[PDB]
Amino acid sequence: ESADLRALAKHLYDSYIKSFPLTKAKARAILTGKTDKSPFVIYDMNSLMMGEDKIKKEVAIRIFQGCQFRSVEAVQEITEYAKSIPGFVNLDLNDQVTLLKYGVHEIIYTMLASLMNKDGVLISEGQGFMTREFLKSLRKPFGDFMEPKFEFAVKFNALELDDSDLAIFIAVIILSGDRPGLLNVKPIEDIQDNLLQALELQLKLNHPESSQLFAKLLQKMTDLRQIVTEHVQLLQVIKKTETDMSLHPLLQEIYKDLY
Ligand SMILES: *[C@H](/C=C\C/C=C\C/C=C\C/C=C\CCC(=O)O)CC(=O)C/C=C\CC
């Protein structure tokens, strides 16, 4: 029944808004220019240094440390959201953990896209804006790492998905039967099938003019997986090069034994 899928789509959107402090609608209102919302921009070290009075130790390291904190916070948000998804909490506990750790990275890059424009990532809950050029500027090996996210985001943004689309699309990512080491796949695939049905309905209703948006959206996932591979490689280099830099336990658990 179409009505059941609509009810599920709304349930997921409701949890999404509650789970994520900053949404695409808010992000884009801040970026687009819809007075008070408007953020302080960091393009250089003077701007970065100036920021702290405006907004709530090597510089490159300090940015990376910031990004770690942000990722940890995102996982927590995604994890809260994941519980909301019908059936996920009922799955085997080991399976829940497996889904979460593979999902988290893919979901983060997707959610990151909403804050991105070709110039920058919003920061500090949309209080600040950091330039893409400034992030590239950071000394090796650090300067490269943001760029892959920007490339995906620009292509991804062209789809121009609503927050309501995103919420369903990410439940689909979390609920993947393919994940390595899953004890039971059948229960997971049945739930994913339902989410995919909700997404299909949602995309047609929300974007009737767009053609094959469902398929196009599903293909992007290939891209997400690619970003993860590159990120892990980058991350392994960072540890060897900087012995002095700590990695968050939660982040460490997610990244280890991955593919
Ligand atoms: C790094 C995470 C976010 C990139 C955006 C901006 C630069 C990072 C931090 C600046 C400080 C605050 C912004 C965030 C906030 O407070 O809301 C991308 C990433 O996924 C890296 C993951 C692991 C590397 C440790």
Swiss-Prot record:
Taxonomic source organism: Homo sapiens (Human)
Main subcellular location of this protein, as a coarse class: nucleus
Ranges of residues in domain NR LBD: 4-257
Binding site for rosiglitazone: Q68, F69, R70, S71, H105, H231, Y255
Name of protein: Peroxisome proliferator-activated receptor gamma
Single annotated GO MF: transcription cis-regulatory region binding
Post-translational modification, as annotated: Phosphorylated in basal conditions and dephosphorylated when treated with the ligand. May be dephosphorylated by PPP5C.
Chain's role: Nuclear receptor that binds peroxisome proliferators such as hypolipidemic drugs and fatty acids. Once activated by a ligand, the nuclear receptor binds to DNA specific PPAR response elements (PPRE) and modulates the transcription of its target genes, such as acyl-CoA oxidase. It therefore controls the peroxisomal beta-oxidation pathway of fatty acids. Key regulator of adipocyte differentiation and glucose homeostasis. ARF6 acts as a key regulator of the tissue-specific adipocyte P2 (aP2) enhancer. (Microbial infection) Upon treatment with M.tuberculosis or its lipoprotein LpqH, phosphorylation of MAPK p38 and IL-6 production are modulated, probably via this protein.
